[PDB]
């Protein structure tokens, strides 16, 4: 069992440390360590072998050090595109290997985004058959957090609200979704449907109508 | 190119047994140790075990021994993991990842350089559902600053994954596949959204071309404006 921190944070241009340790209530000879990077939805990625060694194109700013149970990977001149886990790995001389925890590193500083909301209607194939979902996409938001609220005209609707957590996008900003499930005759008995996001306390709110 | 190619993900019953296929190209086969490695939603990585496919040889983690195996088939550069009497807690992406080796030594290291693309596998009683797929058409209403946004409603499928690709995978400037939402009903849906020039609207044509391997099913549906 090998410990990691589950989070780490430095500003642009920085160094950070991520410390990979045995818990020692066990005795387990460690031997080689290896890290690896892994961005949201991807294969993990091999950074480090041997304790200190880089593969080909793996950028210098990754270093990594070994001191009796505990290992390290020092991340130098810290960039955006840090942000990810990272997981320490070693082998054993019982020709076994463990993983560490995971670390999730972020870059501090980043400014306040304002999220994208595109609301889609229901589609004439989906309303044939006999069904209705209004989507509300939002992207590109930071940080990540909003909040999502449905309307049928004015009034607020909670019934046949599906809505995802947010998730990291590749350029470290974020997205959700939500979705209004609603029958062919509510969709057309009202003069338009709306989905309102807040986000860091101010609202970017879309309508769309059958009319 | 050295490359791990998976087998496809798959549903699985509690207490039944899985077997994921990794076949190895562009080096050969018996001069590497491969891993298998899962990670399960939201959770990190795990090692399983390894094989030999030189000697046949393997380990496994003693979370799994007795039950779980790895088998390779030299003649088609395979390596298999099957796991036996299916927990919901084995609901994990597998993967392959090739062992580089030691420098100074033939044997293994546990730094792992190629890996495979991952085998999605759920461990539920819930039977598979192909999603349906509905257009969701550009408009004046998804238009702003000279770019129009189309795509895809991929809609209450079991289990997860799809995959979504716009034009056969030709196009991926601007496309965002968004993270599915687990409906209350047990079922997900998820959008695949295309951001292109509104000027392309009249000569380009896009199609979603959406896979659910789970279910064996893939479905391409033409977007165009209403």
């Known amino acids: 069992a090998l410990t990691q921190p589950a989070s780490v944070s430095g500003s642009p241009g920085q160094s950070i440390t991520i410390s990979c340790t045995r818990t020692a209530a066990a005795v387990t000879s460690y031997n080689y360590v290896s890290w690896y990077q892994q961005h949201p939805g991807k294969a993990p990625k091999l950074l480090i072998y041997?304790?200190?060694n880089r593969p080909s194109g793996v950028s210098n700013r990754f270093s990594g050090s070994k001191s009796g149970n505990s290992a390290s990977l020092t991340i130098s001149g810290l960039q955006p595109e840090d942000e990810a886990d990272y997981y320490c790995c070693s082998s054993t001389s019982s020709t076994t290997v463990v993983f560490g925890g995971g670390t999730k590193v972020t870059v501090l500083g980043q400014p306040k985004a304002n999220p994208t909301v595109t609301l889609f209607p229901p589609s004439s194939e989906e309303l044939q058959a006999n069904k209705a979902t209004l989507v509300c996409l939002i992207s590109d938001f930071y940080p990540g957090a909003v909040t999502v609220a449905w309307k049928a005209d004015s009034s607020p609707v909670k019934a046949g609200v599906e809505t995802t957590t947010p998730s990291k996008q590749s350029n470290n900003k974020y997205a959700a979704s939500s979705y209004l499930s609603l029958t062919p005759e509510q969709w057309k008995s009202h003069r338009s449907y709306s989905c309102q996001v807040t986000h860091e306390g101010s609202t970017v709110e879309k309508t769309v109508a059958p009319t | 190119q050295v490359q791990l190619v998976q087998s496809g993900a798959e549903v699985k019953k509690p207490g039944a047994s899985v077997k994921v296929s990794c076949k190895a190209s562009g080096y050969t086969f018996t001069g590497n140790y491969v891993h298998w490695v899962r990670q399960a939603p939201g959770q990190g990585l795990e090692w399983m075990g390894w094989?030999?496919?030189?000697?046949?040889?393997?380990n496994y983690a003693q979370k799994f021994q007795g039950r779980v195996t790895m088998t390779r088939d030299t003649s088609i550069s395979t390596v298999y993991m099957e796991l036996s009497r299916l927990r919901s807690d084995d609901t994990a992406v597998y993967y392959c990842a090739r062992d580089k080796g030691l420098r100074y030594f033939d044997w293994l290291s546990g730094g792992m350089d190629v890996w495979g693309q991952g085998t999605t596998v759920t461990v539920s009683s819930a039977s598979t559902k192909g999603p349906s797929v509905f257009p969701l058409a550009p408009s004046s209403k998804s238009t702003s600053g000279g770019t129009a946004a189309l795509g895809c409603l991929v809609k209450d499928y079991f289990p997860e994954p799809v995959t979504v690709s716009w034009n056969s995978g030709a196009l991926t400037s601007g496309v965002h596949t968004f993270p599915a939402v687990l409906q209350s009903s047990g079922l997900y849906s998820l959008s695949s959204v295309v951001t292109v020039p509104s000027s392309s609207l009249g000569t380009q044509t896009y199609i979603c071309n959406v896979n659910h391997k789970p279910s064996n099913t893939k479905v391409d549906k033409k977007v165009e404006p209403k």
């Open positions: 041997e304790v200190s």
């Open positions: 094989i030999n496919p030189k000697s046949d040889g393997t």
